[PDB]
């Protein structure tokens, strides 16, 4: 009966980690930042409204120039916006309208999208022969595509509902690395600023830190009581925030290997759909199911503002690399640019 | 601004193609097809005519879109709101698998799935079309096997009329929202016709209710 011995060993092994994690918990994040000055009330106004989507918007992603952005929706269209003049630079029709994620290449020559078709499609924006055409279809996932992020002009990493993430090579279309270890569907991922590691929240209420080069899990973070819907890296690159279905947000530290602060309120009973940090990292912006995107003081775990301008669930969120705007898509088929 | 003005009229040309495609999209009827795999959805799909399969068919100048999501095998609640807005749900249950097992018999697996879909928060008013397939096999099977294997509380003659009508009542009993949603139950033969007509009639009632919503009557 080696199964009983292995299971017993793991339980003691798991308890040793908890003891080690509790040993390093010298204090709390609130106590350290108790002397910091409150951010005060923060007000943001809808500087622009982007219209043209005729169905629910499930994903958006900014370009690195802080001016162009791409948005996805279930009317089957991938629209590239000019966030300064509201102009529509491109409108890409998708083969399958069940699209759940968007990505903009940091170079700016490509965008990616995927969804219930279990495929990530790469689109070449800069084509000498006129229009925008598809470049590579990355097949090999068994579940639906939940998130995707360009590592470079030739490498993309994707998370799926088959509980595994993959690292692809766009030139050949083959999975360079497969990241396994989650027991539930992986709903989000977030590349590190140094593009060497990434995190991924799953339906098993656990987040895992991976190594792109080696291809194995490094740390596993727990504490959520339901599915992790969104995940985002801190600007410093040594922390990340999670958005789960229990209407709570948590901040995990990579080095301390434990949760630091919890962003919850009794007035909120709707789960988080998207999270994003500001350029300084002081503000944590989260999109909720109660139609309102909330702004949190990440250091003090205090509410600081509300982006109440949508008539349905805020499905996606974004902050420019310049940090001068926030774009908020929602199920009412509108994208709003704030401050 | 010479280049700015030429960019503005490019976007306006994109605007009208987006509106043109939305007009065409709104003229299609979207149906979500569910089942237990071996339930005969392949037969049902053939009657009207990896990832997610789309089926296209037309009936009486009406365009239908049937989405099959039987190949997902993932957490259903993470992608079931994508279909919140379909005209109707076509649920397929095989009547010949009351005694077969997957442990747990195959029929109770469908009832667990039917109960979850019917009482879903995203489907609180969408019409559910229930297709009880394999009526030929079930008719012959009850002669040699009793329905008490599936339902231990069943007390009735092992005839086709009495036994089949008992199974349907068990499925229609799972509908908790009996006042805000209607379940249309039909008995399907493997080799037959007029199943596409039944879907058309159930879809029309949804359209009529949709029209009354716009005019404020209902």
């Amino acid at each position, epitope marked *: 009966s080696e199964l009983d011995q292995l299971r017993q060993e793991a339980e003691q092994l798991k308890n040793q980690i908890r003891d080690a994690r509790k040993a390093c918990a010298d204090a709390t994040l609130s106590q350290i930042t108790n002397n910091i000055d409150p951010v005060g009330r923060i007000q943001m106004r809808t500087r622009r409204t982007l219209r043209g989507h005729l169905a629910k918007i499930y994903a958006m992603h900014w370009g690195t120039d802080s001016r162009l952005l791409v948005s996805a929706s279930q009317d089957g269209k991938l629209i590239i916006w000019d966030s300064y003049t509201t102009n529509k630079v491109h409108a890409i029709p998708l083969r399958s309208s069940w699209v759940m994620t968007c990505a903009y290449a940091p170079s700016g020559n490509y965008v990616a999208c995927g969804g219930l078709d279990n495929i990530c499609s790469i689109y070449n924006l800069k084509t000498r022969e006129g229009n925008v055409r598809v470049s590579r279809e990355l097949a090999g996932h068994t579940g639906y595509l939940s998130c995707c992020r360009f590592l470079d002009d030739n490498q993309i990493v994707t998370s799926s509902g088959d509980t595994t993430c993959a690292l692809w090579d766009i030139e050949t279309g083959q999975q360079t690395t497969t990241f396994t270890g989650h027991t539930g569907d992986v709903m989000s991922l977030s590349l590190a600023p140094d593009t060497r590691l990434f995190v991924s929240g799953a339906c098993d209420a656990s987040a895992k830190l991976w190594d792109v080069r080696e291809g194995m899990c490094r740390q596993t973070f727990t504490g959520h009581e339901s599915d992790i819907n969104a995940i985002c890296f801190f600007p410093n690159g040594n922390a990340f925030a999670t958005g789960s279905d229990d209407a709570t947000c948590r901040l995990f530290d990579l080095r301390a290997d434990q949760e630091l602060m919890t962003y919850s309120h009794d007035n909120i009973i709707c789960g988080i759909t998207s999270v994003s940090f500001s350029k300084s990292g002081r503000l944590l912006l989260a999109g909720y199911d109660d139609f309102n995107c909330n702004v949190w003081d990440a250091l003090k775990a205090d509410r600081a503002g509300v982006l109440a301008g949508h008539d349905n669930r805020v499905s996606c969120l974004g902050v420019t690399d310049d940090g001068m705007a926030v774009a908020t898509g929602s199920w009412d088929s509108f994208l709003k640019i704030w401050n | 601004s010479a280049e700015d003005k030429a*960019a503005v009229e490019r976007s306006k*040309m994109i605007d009208r193609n987006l509106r043109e495609d939305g007009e065409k999209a709104a003229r299609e009827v979207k149906l979500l097809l569910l089942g237990a795999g071996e339930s005969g959805k392949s037969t049902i799909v053939k009657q009207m005519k990896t990832g997610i399969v789309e089926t296209h068919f037309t009936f009486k100048d009406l365009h239908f879109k049937m989405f099959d999501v039987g190949a997902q095998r993932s957490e259903r609640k993470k992608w079931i709101h994508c279909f919140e807005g379909v005209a109707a749900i076509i649920f397929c249950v095989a009547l010949s698998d009351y005694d077969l097992v997957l442990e747990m018999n195959r029929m109770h697996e469908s009832m667990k799935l039917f109960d979850s879909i019917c009482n879903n928060k995203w489907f609180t008013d969408t019409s559910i079309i229930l297709f009880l397939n394999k009526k030929d096999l079930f008719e012959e099977k009850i002669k040699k096997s009793p329905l008490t294997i599936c339902y231990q509380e069943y007390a009735g003659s092992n005839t086709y009329e009495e036994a089949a009508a008992y199974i349907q009542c068990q499925f229609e009993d799972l509908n908790k929202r009996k006042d805000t949603k209607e379940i249309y139950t039909h008995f399907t033969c493997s080799t037959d016709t007029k199943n596409v007509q039944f879907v058309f009639d159930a879809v029309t009632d949804v359209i009529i209710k949709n029209n009354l919503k716009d005019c404020g009557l209902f």
Partner: single-chain antibody
Amino acid sequence: VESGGGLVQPGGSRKLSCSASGFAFSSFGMHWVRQAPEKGLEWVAYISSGSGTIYYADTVKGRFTISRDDPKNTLFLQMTSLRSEDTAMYYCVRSIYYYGSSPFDFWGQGTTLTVSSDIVMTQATSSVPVTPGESVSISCRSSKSLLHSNGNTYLYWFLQRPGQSPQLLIYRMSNLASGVPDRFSGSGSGTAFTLTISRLEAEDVGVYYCMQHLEYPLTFGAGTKL
């Protein structure tokens, strides 16, 4: 690729054609820039994508007519009163306009025909020594500062090698066109501009024209031969 047209006619009327091939011609605005037998280039007409706005040169405003046929991928120029001042080699140019596009990126082969306010770009220099391997610089100037409020200066640089059509090098005065070697560089200050070549090769000889794109009666600079 693109080409087409007629050549010989006395004082009268004629119609030119251009046959686009393999670049999604329906989403491109097209021009009809012409060049006299030994003068510089001069713009003629323009028809936008979707056949919306149409512009004409002031000297051919009433006589000329430009039209496009998106099916069959053809562009037309109709000329009615053909004087002797308008014998030239007529080129077809494609141009697309969105946020970061490169207009005037492709030029046709061109056809010759014979009959038997505005902004002026000076380009004072006309010919320079042809010694290779050096760092040759080409200057330009404009009547008014073509720096718009949106923050980009609409100045374009073209190189016409001897015996072939012009080729775009730099658009909006700083951006290097696709496929052009990184030797070429562009600088300016709104009114005075410069084009720099680091190490000139044997293929860099020819006339270098400058074009403006601020106000639509857009004009060239008579060139700068090497």
